[PDB]
């Protein structure tokens, strides 16, 4: 939907988290919607090796970003239902056209469709990659890999949704399953929301090389929390039982109604002009003038939906009777609508009051006139008129008492106030037949579109007064219903479709709700028939060359295929296919891939270039995947005992952890590039209330920072305007020192507080109290081994500051990856047969196998020395060349700067001359440099020849080895990160998983620190299926940026002996 991510992002400004090598949450399941990848990898013709090189690299990249623990689910598009074939066929036709039109004059992308010759190979290739991976990447070895390829009918998106819905439907489903779906389509956010699984993210890529691309976790846990805040404002006004999950479901129907992939958009919604606030507002008001929800688990209530429609119709109508439409106009429309809802609900309430008022006189009259029929003499000699709605009595006491006064009555009660009633005011008194007339007079007293419009609408339908409109209309309304069912329950029909290119006017949808809608499940086309129902006589050559409905000229007003006419026109030519085409023109199954050490088979490669066979180390089988449905219902909404808010698993965000107040406002929030011109959910944070015992309680202990995304950190000091509380390790117990601030600390503190409060307002719509203190913290960056074999919390060296009000003391669910652990015995910490990294001079970085133990402190191993030849030399050589070739000086700045300041002065010149000079950009963080492009290539050439000199390996039985000559690279990310790296330094990939085969050497060509996280740029010895040429700088795929935790540095050996 057109501004949907943009609009959602600005309005609810904390929903998404940049992935930047800091810890992200653990996930149970990752689902890949892959079709965007295949496209994106087959443009920028390049070769099959290079093409699949990319795709493997992409799938692999996303798999390592998440590290799913249970299920990894890959999906490609099978044959779609008819509801999509017109657009499938419009898209496809535009590609063939644009190819011929553009490029050709001034690879056939359409091959990526099911049944195609390309796609039969793709499945052969991908399968190979999966097998290679499950054989060699340890991380890929404890998950279910499930491939649902193009052989199987349905959209990836939809196939994924059917899996999630099938597993959540069970009676043993983990209630707090952490879900992640990768994909570019904003719609996934809505499908995600549709599942009602709180612990759910979307892997996405930016929207303003692979290792330097930005990816985000969009967090549905906090989005839901924001949504709850969006709609809570009612709770008290709706005429049914308020339920957020049901509200959310209706908000989803509204979102599908606004846009979805199948029906065409309703005309003039004006999204890219700020109707969005208004459309929502529409829903908000509608929800209050209805008898229950619009959406019964995907079933639509048309009666209900037309109450919402009426608002949408007024919307259409008012905006026709406007000139241009802009934000200014929608902002004032938003106000008017709110004001109307307020007025309307006030009248509604006056009406209710008046009704109660009438029943009341209506019940009093006969008992009053009988009471006043008896003249007084000389209290219990009368009937009392009890009143029963105490709560409503109590809200109406001035009235009741004035009523009582007027009719000559008292409003009485009881000491315990459990009974109210009227009674004659007897203590207040003859032709007093004037009391009976005064009573009677008192009782009497209380008993008191446009036409230019229709035409302008008619001139729309003509362009692209009847009852074939009832037919259009009803097709559209049917559609909405097909869409919702599709998403909440599964494809309801392989054959339903919207038979028109355009949507009706909003104010007309009404004509089409007077229907009873059912569907017939049907069955999907065979591949080749779909192949024909889509594809133009311009990419005819992907269809088995053997075969109107196919223009050369064509909002794409491409004709709709007559299906009946088509299955038949092909069945002549049906029996003439190969055995491979009868293979391609059928359906497959989902496949499942398992790891099994006792499997040892040879897997042939369907690829050239850098790929080979998977040898005596091949370890996967494929199988058909079932699913096991039964007499099982789907589960709609949250599962029983699902943890939400402050009880969410670690890693996932929550607003519920602090105490706060939320309000929609024009906060000019700056989520992207310019300040939003619409309201944000502004968060007003409440201070928690000593400041001395606070310091004493938490100093040097673990407190939670980053609010929104609470991670553990250690509290270092507690700045204040006039006082610093510091932490000093006294050995065992760290204690608190209080002192006045130094001038720069008092400077920093004032400059910091002002900077935080406005950044939180401008960037996140968090309105802070005003900064009391300031917790200074460092975050937990892993675990780390101590001498005694124990493992304990490690911390990032970089100081961060947070207002104290955003500091949380504790959290129910703690990040398991950071539970400190006690020492272990040799045989458990390095079990017999375990594979390990040998430190120590014989083979620094050698593959080691634990054979047994000599002692209970010494162990014996087999160490493979992977090479008997000296490490190559150039990196080092070149590093010193560059540094000698480009000397730096202190102000009292590089020789190339000297030449630029001597060029500018000698020309006296400007200005553009300077902008011209600025073209070759050397723009990067402070500790991070590079080898000269020259050097880079010299390193490449001198490697290419090194890696073809004769060379051999060598093993050695070793014994009496002390535990610290060996390490588990697996669980030493911190140690490894702690290593210097310099340009030229020889390096080895040391990790049992990732994108480089174990033990590969390379040279460091340049480092790049994104603050705290270092990324080493490695020119590898051998080519790497996952690498690149560092954007031309190289001539082969030897290049890769990588995190230091993957690398042993062999030049500057920092862990030897
Ligand atoms: Mn979509």
From TrEMBL:
<keyword id="KW-0269">Exonuclease</keyword>
<comment type="function">
    <text>Multifunctional protein that exhibits several independent functions at different levels of the cellular processes. 5'-3' exonuclease component of the nonsense-mediated mRNA decay (NMD) which is a highly conserved mRNA degradation pathway, an RNA surveillance system whose role is to identify and rid cells of mRNA with premature termination codons and thus prevents accumulation of potentially harmful truncated proteins.</text>
</comment>
<dbReference type="InterPro" id="IPR016494">
    <property type="entry name" value="5_3_exoribonuclease_1"/>
</dbReference>
<dbReference type="Pfam" id="PF18334">
    <property type="entry name" value="XRN1_D2_D3"/>
</dbReference>
<feature type="domain" description="Xrn1 helical">
    <location>
        <begin position="242"/>
        <end position="597"/>
    </location>
</feature>
<feature type="domain" description="5'-3' exoribonuclease 1 D1">
    <location>
        <begin position="637"/>
        <end position="821"/>
    </location>
</feature>
<dbReference type="InterPro" id="IPR047008">
    <property type="entry name" value="XRN1_SH3_sf"/>
</dbReference>
<feature type="domain" description="Xrn1 N-terminal">
    <location>
        <begin position="1"/>
        <end position="206"/>
    </location>
</feature>
<dbReference type="GO" id="GO:0005737">
    <property type="term" value="C:cytoplasm"/>
</dbReference>
<dbReference type="GO" id="GO:0003723">
    <property type="term" value="F:RNA binding"/>
</dbReference>
<dbReference type="InterPro" id="IPR041106">
    <property type="entry name" value="XRN1_D2_D3"/>
</dbReference>
<keyword id="KW-0866">Nonsense-mediated mRNA decay</keyword>
<dbReference type="InterPro" id="IPR014722">
    <property type="entry name" value="Rib_uL2_dom2"/>
</dbReference>
<keyword id="KW-0540">Nuclease</keyword>
<dbReference type="Pfam" id="PF03159">
    <property type="entry name" value="XRN_N"/>
</dbReference>
<feature type="binding site">
    <location>
        <position position="185"/>
    </location>
    <ligand>
        <name>Mn(2+)</name>
    </ligand>
</feature>
<comment type="similarity">
    <text>Belongs to the 5'-3' exonuclease family.</text>
</comment>
<dbReference type="InterPro" id="IPR041385">
    <property type="entry name" value="SH3_12"/>
</dbReference>
<keyword id="KW-0378">Hydrolase</keyword>
<feature type="binding site">
    <location>
        <position position="261"/>
    </location>
    <ligand>
        <name>Mn(2+)</name>
    </ligand>
</feature>
<dbReference type="GO" id="GO:0004534">
    <property type="term" value="F:5'-3' RNA exonuclease activity"/>
</dbReference>
<keyword id="KW-0694">RNA-binding</keyword>
<dbReference type="Pfam" id="PF18129">
    <property type="entry name" value="SH3_12"/>
</dbReference>
<dbReference type="InterPro" id="IPR027073">
    <property type="entry name" value="5_3_exoribonuclease"/>
</dbReference>
<dbReference type="InterPro" id="IPR004859">
    <property type="entry name" value="Xrn1_N"/>
</dbReference>
<dbReference type="GO" id="GO:0046872">
    <property type="term" value="F:metal ion binding"/>
</dbReference>
<feature type="domain" description="5'-3' exoribonuclease 1 SH3-like">
    <location>
        <begin position="979"/>
        <end position="1049"/>
    </location>
</feature>
<feature type="binding site">
    <location>
        <position position="187"/>
    </location>
    <ligand>
        <name>Mn(2+)</name>
    </ligand>
</feature>
<dbReference type="GO" id="GO:0000184">
    <property type="term" value="P:nuclear-transcribed mRNA catabolic process, nonsense-mediated decay"/>
</dbReference>
<dbReference type="Pfam" id="PF17846">
    <property type="entry name" value="XRN_M"/>
</dbReference>
<dbReference type="Pfam" id="PF18332">
    <property type="entry name" value="XRN1_D1"/>
</dbReference>
<dbReference type="InterPro" id="IPR047007">
    <property type="entry name" value="XRN1_D1_sf"/>
</dbReference>
<keyword id="KW-0479">Metal-binding</keyword>
<dbReference type="InterPro" id="IPR041412">
    <property type="entry name" value="Xrn1_helical"/>
</dbReference>
<keyword id="KW-0963">Cytoplasm</keyword>
<dbReference type="GO" id="GO:0005634">
    <property type="term" value="C:nucleus"/>
</dbReference>
<dbReference type="InterPro" id="IPR040992">
    <property type="entry name" value="XRN1_D1"/>
</dbReference>
<protein>
    <recommendedName>
        <fullName>5'-3' exoribonuclease 1</fullName>
        <ecNumber>3.1.13.-</ecNumber>
    </recommendedName>
</protein>
<dbReference type="GO" id="GO:0016075">
    <property type="term" value="P:rRNA catabolic process"/>
</dbReference>
